[model samples]
Target: THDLRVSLEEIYSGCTKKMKILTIEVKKGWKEGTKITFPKADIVFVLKDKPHNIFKRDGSDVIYPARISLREALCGCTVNVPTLDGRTIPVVFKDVIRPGMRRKVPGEGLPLPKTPEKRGDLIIEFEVIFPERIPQTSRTVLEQVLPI
Candidate 1:
């Protein structure tokens, strides 16, 4: 019943932890909540990798929320996002960002535990922020601006 996080770096580089014993009782195929019987004398160990400030883990994939201005979402936008590996990725969208819209970045997610060579994608859900009040200066522009 051992469960903990293995870092994306460790998983990517094909690293292994020094587990004292092999898995016991391999009867059923991998299923949820399955447990292995360990020797009473055996010791257990686990690692919780550094907390991710930006991405939330989902299987091999990562999901995040990126906030952008309403005008940026409509006119055009380039969102700067931080990755699990401490990299900044710029995502661009020329079209309008509808509510509940998500963008997927290919091969930008964590490596799979079973298959480190294969990887998942980074999914970003967009949030638009509109000004509480349009400026008095914007009144002139607002009049000329037709409804979309």
Candidate 2:
């Protein structure tokens, strides 16, 4: 069995690869561990996904992690998401983001294995970062508006 390293971009956009003795056709939405066998050859090619910096794959779905400040979590903001197809989409949040909160973007993930025209969802997981210590002036203001 041979390992064929496939990039996320290549998987998103199908391509044809020419090997030394064989031609490999990579289709869209091909996942890791897909086997390619030649009719008369004894060798088998297995697909392996190259690690992407911003996206993590789960079947057809993709996950993107974003870090936000505590203020943003409370006050609501818009997150600009870079898509696999070179598009930037904005996700606005009016509700507060709780711990382990996630937002999903439809049709923003990898293509369907059987259907190239259909895609999966993109999940944006939020991680809220808090300050080590609150300022005295800010704490006083918070105490006035916040419920004890």
Candidate 3:
């Protein structure tokens, strides 16, 4: 069994890899564990997803972790999401981002195994970073604005 390392970019757009003797065709939307069979040698090519720095995989879906400030979580913020296809999608959050909040970007994930024309969703899981200390004046103002 030959393990082949694949990048998310190549998986997203499909690529051809030139082996020593044979040319391997890495089809679009192929996920991990998908194998390619060979003739007499029984050479099997197993697809392995390489670890990406910014993205995580959930089957055909993609998960992105975003860090936002406490003020941004309470108010509103617009974040630019980088898609697999090299496009930036601007997502605007109108509602408050509570704990464990996830925003979904439709059709921005990996392509479906069966249907290469369509893709899965991109989920953004936000991490709200709170300030450790605040000014006394700001604290007093915050107490007036928020009862809790």
- Which of the two, 2 or 3, has more lDDT? 2
TM-score of 1: 0.65
Clashes of each: 0, 0, 0
Scanning candidate 2 in windows of ten residues, the lowest lDDT window is: 14-23
Candidates in order, TM-scores: namely 0.65, 0.88, 0.87
Candidate 1: C-alpha RMSD to true structure equals: 5.7
- Give a tens-digit lDDT track for model 2, residues 1-148: 7788888888999778776758899999999999999775487899999999988888888888878888899999788988998788999998889767999998999999899899989999998999889999999999998789
Give lDDT tens digits, candidate 3, residues 1-148: 8888888888888899876646788988799999887883688888999999878988888998888998889999887888886778889988889867998898999888789999999999998999999999999999999869
Cα error, candidate 1, residue 55 (Å) = 1.1
Residue runs of model 2 more than 4 Å from their true location after superposition: 39-41, 143-148
True-vs-predicted CA distance for residue 27, candidate 2, Å? 0.8
Determine which window of 10 residues in candidate 3 has minimal summed lDDT: 17-26
